[PDB]
Scaffold this motif. Sequence first.
Motif, short mmCIF file in Angstrom:
data_model
loop_
_atom_site.label_atom_id
_atom_site.label_comp_id
_atom_site.label_asym_id
_atom_site.label_seq_id
_atom_site.Cartn_x
_atom_site.Cartn_y
_atom_site.Cartn_z
N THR A 1 0.83 -1.19 0.00
CA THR A 1 0.00 0.00 0.00
C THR A 1 0.87 1.25 0.00
O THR A 1 2.11 1.19 -0.10
N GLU A 2 0.22 2.41 0.12
CA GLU A 2 0.90 3.69 0.08
C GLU A 2 1.56 4.00 1.42
O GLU A 2 1.06 3.64 2.48
N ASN A 3 2.71 4.69 1.35
CA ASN A 3 3.37 5.20 2.54
C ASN A 3 2.75 6.53 2.92
O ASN A 3 2.78 7.49 2.14
N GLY B 1 9.86 6.36 -1.00
CA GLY B 1 8.92 6.44 -2.10
C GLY B 1 7.47 6.38 -1.63
O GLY B 1 7.16 5.90 -0.54
N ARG B 2 6.58 6.88 -2.49
CA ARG B 2 5.16 6.94 -2.14
C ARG B 2 4.61 5.55 -1.83
O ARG B 2 4.00 5.33 -0.78
N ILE B 3 4.82 4.61 -2.73
CA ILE B 3 4.28 3.26 -2.58
C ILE B 3 5.27 2.40 -1.82
O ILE B 3 6.49 2.56 -1.92
N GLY B 4 4.74 1.46 -1.04
CA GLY B 4 5.56 0.58 -0.23
C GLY B 4 6.64 -0.13 -1.01
O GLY B 4 6.40 -0.61 -2.12
#
Lengths: 103, 305, 122, 121
Positions: free
Chosen positions: B144-146, D50-53
């Motif tokens: 998922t997104e951080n 980064g935005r995504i894991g």
Amino acid sequence: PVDARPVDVSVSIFINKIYGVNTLEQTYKVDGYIVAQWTGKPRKTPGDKPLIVENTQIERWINNGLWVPALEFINVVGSPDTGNKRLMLFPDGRVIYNARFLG
Amino acid sequence: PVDARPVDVSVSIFINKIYGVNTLEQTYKVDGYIVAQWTGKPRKTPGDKPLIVENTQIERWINNGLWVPALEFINVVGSPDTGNKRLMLFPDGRVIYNARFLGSFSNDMDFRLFPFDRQQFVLELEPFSYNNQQLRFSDIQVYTENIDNEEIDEWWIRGKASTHISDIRYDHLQPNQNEFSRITVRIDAVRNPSYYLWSFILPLGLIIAASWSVFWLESFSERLQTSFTCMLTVVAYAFYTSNILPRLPYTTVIDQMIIAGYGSIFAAILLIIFAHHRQADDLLIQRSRLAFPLGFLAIGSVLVI
Amino acid sequence: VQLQESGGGLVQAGGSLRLSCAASGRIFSTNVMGWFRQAPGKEREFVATVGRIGGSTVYADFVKGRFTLSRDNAKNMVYLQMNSLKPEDTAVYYCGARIGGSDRLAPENYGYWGQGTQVTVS
Amino acid sequence: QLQESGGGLVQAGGSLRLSCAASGRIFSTNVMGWFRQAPGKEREFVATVGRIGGSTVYADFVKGRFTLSRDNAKNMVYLQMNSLKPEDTAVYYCGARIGGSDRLAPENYGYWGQGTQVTVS
């Protein structure tokens, strides 16, 4: 000089949801699957097993002479959104058409 | 010398964004990537290196006999918007399929506790044509997104993504050919009640409370007339709320407050008339300035059961 | 809503059993009922329940076509015909009722569990 | 408040492990990023998450030589720098992203630390 009997088509419809009623237009959305099954011309298949033909490969089989009649939704407003579609072609001539639709 | 064992398919799902909840339709939008990997028969590639095939070129390989099975989103609504897609073919036989997707997905969503509701956003994946004798899912991983700060986001993701791999057996369908392998992903989330507490619930409380002040007026005429302005103020507020809050087939928590307001002001109107037209004395029962807010909050408490 | 399981007992590898779960109370249908199991030391894990679409049923990966879920909405009951048992299947088989949410496979979305029926395979 | 450490003098080709201690209202180390500024030059991006894991953003000069990691337990991030060269000599700063829509923009970072000097011969 003797005519051929009509092709019998068995149909199964699976309804997932009915929603999006538009009262003024008297419409509603329906998401589901439609299955149609008939017996056509016998044919050869790999290993004589049922063959699965998916999506755009279906049109290649049509161009080469496979018969797939168009079944129309009489009361659909506009072209329905078709997702995945599939042909299962048996050696004995059976054809099963399976497709996802939203309309 | 064929291999009739099921093809094991490993899947990875990268979720970029979940948004666009539609409450009446119980849908939501998901943007992300889907990665599917399986091992086929080895092959020769240019330079004995992995071969990349993008978008339209994939169709040419399927025509040549390359097996690329369709994986359907069971709970997608309509055809998802597939962006770029790619295949990677290794000499040892590995095949990796990767695709960007945007789709609307349906699920059972319950908004009765709105704006304090929790939801389970679900992705269900299954092969469209191949049963678990031909194609079975071996594992599923979800990324998922951080998140930096959640105070700005409409939903707060509580816990890691849950996954399942199960079998679906269809009655409508040789023996042991009526069973399909299914992946299920679940993202638990909780709504951000901040906006709804300060802009909707709090002003509605001051309105209801402010309507209790009619008991402090020193005349029947003033008590009964001001009540109508109070009623008019709750109705004017019901429009402001309905114009912003989501449409549903049931009442929410805010809808019940509004009904409580209607009931309070209507009850007070009956008390104002009874006190004044039962005797000829009146002002003393109108000293229920404390008894009314307690009865409201009293009922207001048994409503929370 | 009250659920009561039944049909357990002892059996040898490759045997068969037929579990029954009787629902008593306010239930809209048996679609909401699902079978679970919990062996000593292992979590309570999903076994089976009805599918979203008619004619479909959800089975845990370990079922492998051995178990079969059936229902008698009239008698307000669901049955689990277990065949080709194995030692790994030994556990306490509970019967839950989906209390909401959209994860039929999630025990957290079930409640009104019964006293459970013990099943042991040798 | 942020504090850097781990700098020093190293021979061309050597390694260093910069550390950034974070204190205060910081729910996660994702918001933190590394920067560097040589004398006379502008503060340039180096690395952040980064935005995504599973993804991490690195400046184009890193070329796989640096690696950003995080110790959420101690609430920290580390910049493991290898194959260092004279071009890498600068003061390395640690920043915290305070909104905006650009992970690589110094303008979107506040709470900078004192910085820790890295010097390569």
